[PDB]
Coordinates of C-alpha atoms in Angstrom, one line a residue:
Chain A
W4 CA 9.9 24.9 4.9
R5 CA 12.7 24.7 7.4
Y6 CA 11.5 23.1 10.6
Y7 CA 13.4 22.4 13.8
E8 CA 12.9 19.9 16.6
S9 CA 12.2 22.7 19.1
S10 CA 8.8 23.9 17.7
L11 CA 6.1 23.1 15.3
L12 CA 6.4 26.6 13.7
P13 CA 8.5 27.0 10.6
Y14 CA 11.4 29.4 10.7
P15 CA 12.2 30.7 7.2
Chain B
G9 CA -0.5 4.2 -1.3
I10 CA 0.3 5.8 2.0
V11 CA -0.2 9.1 3.9
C12 CA 3.0 10.7 5.4
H13 CA 3.8 13.8 7.3
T14 CA 5.5 16.4 5.1
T15 CA 7.5 19.5 5.9
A16 CA 6.7 21.0 2.5
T17 CA 3.4 22.4 4.0
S18 CA 2.8 25.0 6.7
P19 CA 1.9 23.9 9.3
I20 CA 3.2 20.3 8.9
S21 CA 0.3 18.1 7.7
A22 CA -0.3 14.6 6.5
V23 CA -0.5 14.3 2.7
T24 CA -1.1 11.4 0.3
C25 CA 2.2 10.5 -1.4
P26 CA 2.5 10.6 -5.2
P27 CA 2.3 7.4 -7.1
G28 CA 5.3 5.2 -6.6
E29 CA 6.4 6.8 -3.3
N30 CA 5.0 4.5 -0.7
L31 CA 7.2 5.0 2.4
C32 CA 7.7 7.9 4.8
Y33 CA 11.1 9.4 5.8
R34 CA 12.2 11.8 8.5
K35 CA 15.7 13.4 8.1
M36 CA 17.4 15.5 10.7
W37 CA 20.8 17.2 10.8
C38 CA 22.5 20.1 12.6
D39 CA 22.8 23.5 11.1
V40 CA 24.2 26.8 12.5
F41 CA 21.3 27.1 14.9
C42 CA 21.4 23.5 16.2
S43 CA 22.5 24.7 19.6
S44 CA 19.4 26.9 20.1
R45 CA 16.7 25.3 17.9
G46 CA 17.9 21.7 17.7
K47 CA 18.2 19.7 14.5
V48 CA 16.6 20.5 11.2
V49 CA 13.6 18.4 10.6
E50 CA 12.7 17.3 7.0
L51 CA 9.7 15.1 6.4
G52 CA 8.2 13.7 3.2
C53 CA 7.4 10.8 1.0
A54 CA 9.9 8.6 -0.9
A55 CA 10.2 5.5 -3.0
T56 CA 13.6 4.5 -1.6
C57 CA 15.1 5.3 1.8
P58 CA 17.3 8.4 1.5
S59 CA 21.1 7.7 1.7
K60 CA 22.2 8.8 5.1
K61 CA 25.3 10.9 5.7
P62 CA 27.2 9.8 8.8
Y63 CA 26.0 13.0 10.7
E64 CA 22.4 12.8 9.3
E65 CA 19.6 11.0 11.0
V66 CA 17.2 9.2 8.6
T67 CA 14.2 7.1 9.5
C68 CA 12.1 5.2 7.0
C69 CA 8.7 3.6 7.7
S70 CA 5.7 2.4 5.8
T71 CA 2.7 3.0 8.0
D72 CA 0.4 6.0 7.9
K73 CA 1.7 9.1 9.7
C74 CA 4.7 7.1 11.0
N75 CA 7.1 10.0 10.3
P76 CA 5.9 12.8 12.7
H77 CA 7.8 15.9 13.7
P78 CA 9.7 15.1 16.9
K79 CA 6.9 17.1 18.7
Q80 CA 4.3 14.6 17.7
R81 CA 3.9 10.8 18.2
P82 CA 3.3 8.4 15.4
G83 CA -0.1 7.2 14.3
Chain C
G9 CA 0.2 -4.0 1.0
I10 CA 3.2 -5.0 -1.1
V11 CA 4.8 -8.0 -2.7
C12 CA 8.4 -8.7 -2.2
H13 CA 11.2 -11.2 -2.6
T14 CA 12.1 -13.1 0.6
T15 CA 15.1 -15.4 1.3
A16 CA 12.8 -17.3 3.7
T17 CA 11.6 -19.5 0.7
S18 CA 13.6 -21.7 -1.6
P19 CA 14.1 -20.8 -4.4
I20 CA 13.8 -17.0 -3.7
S21 CA 10.2 -16.0 -4.5
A22 CA 8.0 -13.0 -4.2
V23 CA 5.5 -13.1 -1.3
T24 CA 2.8 -10.9 0.1
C25 CA 4.0 -9.0 3.1
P26 CA 2.2 -9.4 6.5
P27 CA 0.0 -6.6 7.9
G28 CA 2.0 -3.6 8.9
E29 CA 5.1 -4.4 6.9
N30 CA 4.8 -2.4 3.7
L31 CA 8.4 -1.9 2.5
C32 CA 11.0 -4.3 1.2
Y33 CA 14.7 -4.6 2.1
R34 CA 17.8 -6.2 0.7
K35 CA 20.7 -6.7 3.2
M36 CA 24.2 -7.7 2.2
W37 CA 27.3 -8.3 4.2
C38 CA 30.5 -10.3 3.9
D39 CA 30.7 -13.6 5.8
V40 CA 33.5 -16.1 5.9
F41 CA 33.0 -17.1 2.2
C42 CA 32.9 -13.5 0.9
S43 CA 36.0 -14.2 -1.3
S44 CA 34.4 -17.1 -3.1
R45 CA 30.6 -16.5 -3.0
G46 CA 30.4 -12.8 -2.4
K47 CA 28.2 -11.1 0.2
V48 CA 25.4 -12.9 2.0
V49 CA 22.0 -11.8 0.6
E50 CA 18.9 -11.4 2.8
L51 CA 15.6 -10.2 1.4
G52 CA 12.2 -9.7 2.9
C53 CA 9.4 -7.4 4.1
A54 CA 9.6 -4.9 6.9
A55 CA 7.9 -1.9 8.5
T56 CA 11.1 0.1 9.1
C57 CA 14.3 0.1 7.2
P58 CA 17.0 -1.9 9.1
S59 CA 19.7 0.1 10.8
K60 CA 22.7 -0.5 8.6
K61 CA 26.1 -1.0 10.2
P62 CA 29.1 0.6 8.4
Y63 CA 30.0 -2.7 6.6
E64 CA 26.5 -3.8 5.9
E65 CA 24.5 -3.0 2.8
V66 CA 20.9 -2.0 3.2
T67 CA 18.7 -0.5 0.4
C68 CA 15.0 0.1 1.0
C69 CA 12.2 0.5 -1.5
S70 CA 8.4 0.4 -1.6
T71 CA 7.3 -0.9 -5.0
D72 CA 6.4 -4.5 -5.7
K73 CA 9.3 -6.9 -6.1
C74 CA 11.7 -4.0 -5.8
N75 CA 14.3 -5.9 -3.7
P76 CA 15.6 -8.6 -6.1
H77 CA 18.5 -10.9 -5.5
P78 CA 21.6 -9.4 -7.1
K79 CA 21.3 -12.0 -9.9
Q80 CA 17.9 -10.7 -11.0
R81 CA 16.2 -7.5 -12.3
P82 CA 13.7 -5.5 -10.2
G83 CA 10.1 -5.3 -11.4
Chain D
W5 CA 17.8 -19.8 3.7
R6 CA 21.4 -18.4 3.5
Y7 CA 22.0 -17.0 0.0
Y8 CA 25.0 -15.3 -1.6
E9 CA 25.4 -12.9 -4.4
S10 CA 26.9 -15.5 -6.7
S11 CA 23.9 -17.7 -7.2
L12 CA 20.1 -17.9 -6.8
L13 CA 20.6 -21.4 -5.1
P14 CA 21.0 -21.4 -1.3
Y15 CA 24.2 -22.7 0.3
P16 CA 23.2 -23.6 3.9
Chain E
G2 CA -8.7 -15.3 3.0
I3 CA -11.7 -13.5 4.5
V4 CA -14.2 -11.7 2.3
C5 CA -15.5 -8.4 3.6
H6 CA -17.8 -5.6 2.6
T7 CA -16.0 -2.4 1.6
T8 CA -17.2 1.1 1.3
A9 CA -14.2 2.0 -0.9
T10 CA -16.3 1.1 -4.0
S11 CA -19.6 2.3 -5.4
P12 CA -21.9 0.5 -5.1
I13 CA -20.6 -1.3 -2.0
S14 CA -19.0 -4.6 -3.0
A15 CA -17.1 -7.4 -1.3
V16 CA -13.3 -7.7 -1.4
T17 CA -10.9 -10.5 -0.4
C18 CA -8.8 -9.3 2.5
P19 CA -5.0 -9.5 2.2
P20 CA -3.1 -12.2 4.2
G21 CA -3.1 -11.7 7.9
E22 CA -6.3 -9.5 7.8
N23 CA -8.9 -12.0 8.9
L24 CA -11.5 -9.7 10.3
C25 CA -14.2 -7.5 8.8
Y26 CA -15.2 -4.2 10.5
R27 CA -18.0 -1.7 10.4
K28 CA -17.4 1.7 11.9
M29 CA -20.2 4.2 12.5
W30 CA -20.2 7.7 13.9
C31 CA -22.3 10.9 13.6
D32 CA -21.4 13.7 11.3
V33 CA -23.4 16.9 10.8
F34 CA -26.2 15.1 8.9
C35 CA -26.7 12.4 11.6
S36 CA -30.1 13.7 12.5
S37 CA -31.4 13.3 8.9
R38 CA -29.3 10.5 7.5
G39 CA -28.0 8.6 10.5
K40 CA -24.4 7.7 11.1
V41 CA -21.6 7.6 8.5
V42 CA -20.9 4.0 7.6
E43 CA -17.4 2.6 6.9
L44 CA -16.8 -1.1 6.0
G45 CA -13.5 -2.8 5.3
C46 CA -10.8 -5.3 6.3
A47 CA -8.5 -5.3 9.4
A48 CA -5.8 -7.3 11.0
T49 CA -6.7 -6.1 14.6
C50 CA -10.2 -5.1 15.6
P51 CA -10.3 -1.3 15.6
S52 CA -10.2 0.1 19.2
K53 CA -13.5 1.5 20.2
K54 CA -13.3 5.3 20.6
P55 CA -16.0 6.9 22.8
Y56 CA -17.8 8.6 19.9
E57 CA -17.5 5.8 17.3
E58 CA -19.5 2.5 17.2
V59 CA -17.6 -0.5 15.9
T60 CA -18.5 -4.1 15.0
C61 CA -15.8 -6.6 14.3
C62 CA -16.3 -10.1 13.0
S63 CA -14.5 -13.1 11.4
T64 CA -16.9 -14.6 8.9
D65 CA -17.1 -13.8 5.2
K66 CA -19.2 -10.7 4.5
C67 CA -20.2 -10.4 8.1
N68 CA -20.0 -6.5 8.0
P69 CA -22.9 -5.5 5.7
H70 CA -24.2 -2.0 5.3
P71 CA -27.2 -1.7 7.7
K72 CA -29.5 -1.6 4.7
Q73 CA -28.7 -5.1 3.4
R74 CA -28.5 -8.7 4.3
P75 CA -25.2 -10.1 5.6
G76 CA -23.5 -13.0 3.8
Chain F
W7 CA -17.5 8.7 -1.3
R8 CA -19.3 8.7 2.1
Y9 CA -22.1 6.4 3.1
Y10 CA -24.9 6.7 5.7
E11 CA -27.0 4.0 7.3
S12 CA -30.1 5.4 5.6
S13 CA -29.2 4.4 2.0
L14 CA -26.9 2.2 0.0
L15 CA -26.1 5.1 -2.3
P16 CA -22.9 7.2 -1.7
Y17 CA -23.0 10.9 -1.4
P18 CA -20.0 13.2 -2.2
Chain G
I22 CA -10.9 9.6 -11.6
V23 CA -13.4 6.8 -10.9
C24 CA -12.6 3.4 -12.4
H25 CA -13.9 -0.1 -12.5
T26 CA -12.0 -2.6 -10.4
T27 CA -11.8 -6.4 -10.5
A28 CA -10.6 -6.5 -6.9
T29 CA -14.2 -6.7 -5.7
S30 CA -17.1 -9.1 -6.2
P31 CA -19.2 -8.1 -7.9
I32 CA -17.1 -5.7 -10.0
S33 CA -17.5 -2.1 -8.7
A34 CA -16.1 1.3 -9.3
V35 CA -13.4 2.9 -7.1
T36 CA -12.1 6.4 -6.9
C37 CA -8.4 6.4 -7.8
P38 CA -5.9 7.9 -5.3
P39 CA -4.2 11.2 -6.1
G40 CA -1.9 11.1 -9.1
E41 CA -3.6 8.0 -10.6
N42 CA -5.7 9.6 -13.4
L43 CA -6.1 6.6 -15.7
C44 CA -8.3 3.5 -15.8
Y45 CA -6.8 0.4 -17.3
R46 CA -8.1 -2.9 -18.6
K47 CA -5.6 -5.8 -18.9
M48 CA -6.5 -9.0 -20.7
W49 CA -4.5 -12.2 -21.3
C50 CA -5.2 -15.8 -22.0
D51 CA -4.9 -18.4 -19.2
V52 CA -5.5 -22.2 -19.6
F53 CA -9.3 -21.7 -20.1
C54 CA -9.0 -19.1 -22.8
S55 CA -10.7 -21.4 -25.4
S56 CA -13.9 -21.7 -23.3
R57 CA -14.1 -18.6 -21.1
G58 CA -12.0 -16.1 -23.0
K59 CA -9.2 -13.9 -21.7
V60 CA -8.7 -13.0 -18.1
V61 CA -9.9 -9.5 -17.3
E62 CA -8.2 -7.1 -14.8
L63 CA -9.5 -3.6 -14.3
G64 CA -8.2 -0.9 -12.1
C65 CA -6.4 2.5 -11.6
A66 CA -3.0 3.6 -12.7
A67 CA -0.7 6.6 -12.9
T68 CA 1.2 5.4 -15.9
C69 CA -0.3 3.0 -18.4
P70 CA 0.7 -0.6 -17.3
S71 CA 3.5 -2.0 -19.5
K72 CA 2.2 -4.9 -21.7
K73 CA 3.9 -8.3 -21.2
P74 CA 4.2 -10.3 -24.4
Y75 CA 0.9 -12.2 -23.9
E76 CA -1.0 -9.3 -22.4
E77 CA -3.4 -6.8 -23.9
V78 CA -3.6 -3.4 -22.1
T79 CA -6.0 -0.5 -22.7
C80 CA -5.7 2.8 -20.7
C81 CA -8.2 5.7 -20.6
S82 CA -8.9 8.8 -18.6
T83 CA -12.7 9.3 -18.4
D84 CA -14.8 8.0 -15.5
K85 CA -15.6 4.3 -15.7
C86 CA -14.1 4.0 -19.1
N87 CA -12.7 0.5 -18.4
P88 CA -15.8 -1.7 -18.1
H89 CA -15.8 -5.4 -18.1
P90 CA -16.3 -6.4 -21.7
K91 CA -19.8 -7.5 -20.9
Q92 CA -21.0 -4.1 -19.8
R93 CA -21.3 -0.5 -21.0
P94 CA -18.6 2.1 -20.4
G95 CA -19.5 5.3 -18.6
Chain H
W9 CA -11.1 -13.9 -7.6
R10 CA -10.5 -14.1 -11.4
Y11 CA -12.7 -12.7 -14.2
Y12 CA -13.0 -13.6 -17.8
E13 CA -14.6 -11.7 -20.7
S14 CA -17.3 -14.4 -20.9
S15 CA -19.0 -13.6 -17.6
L16 CA -19.2 -10.9 -15.0
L17 CA -19.1 -13.6 -12.2
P18 CA -15.7 -14.4 -10.6
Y19 CA -14.0 -17.7 -10.5
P20 CA -12.1 -19.0 -7.6

């Protein structure tokens, strides 16, 4: 899954 | 043997690494949304430390849950 | 827990790593004698992979005796 | 001990 | 090295602790069956004595097989 | 395996 | 898989971590082989351990299939 | 410890 440093929710 | 955070699951969880992969790694790099969301975060297990591009950020460690998502502290 | 080559002993041998250091490293870099002897070789245990300078050589692995001296075979 | 790629024997 | 009881095996047996791990530990806490079975029991090795959390009960010691299951004789 | 103080036999 | 292990005293059975679905027995002669027989090592493995020239290795995938020679399997 | 096929008891 794509994650980002800004949140624990994945973005795909 | 070792448990490491992995981004393969949703939500991120701590998983037991397959045989022969006994270190954790965190890898971060900027994509198109880096300005708004920050860097990509990729977490998993590995046998060898991933080879780091000059613009990538790679962390390798060998204690349980030492590779958290930036929004979580180790341990 | 992990066994790894260390340059702290003479001759190089495989040692059991202290608590909390569960990965091995090999580090190579040129010193004054690089033309005649090649790169300096340093092997040991570690918790985190050493931060590699551009001219340094660092490879990290997490299986027993995976960090041999260049003149030896892993395993 | 200081080692080099050329030998398994130390040089220091 | 120190010998310590471990719950990783069945039946409970004693293991030789790795280098630098020179204490045994027993860790006990209530789960759902605490009223009928009592506290969960965990025995093993450690380098540092586990930090006592408010809901856990911990015993740490530095003699061989000093961390028996409550239902058996130490040593 | 999971032990309890009441017995030397493991459960799960 | 549950497997016998020589890491403990007395020998006991351990549950192997994920991905390690074999038991192994490894035997080889040391100096006392004439009087005591071969060294015995029992444990878990993902891949069957590769046999060194002097070693004997057996791998199996049923619970407690790797007993010490002086005891029943299973 | 160290085991041998001759006994279930360990050596060193």
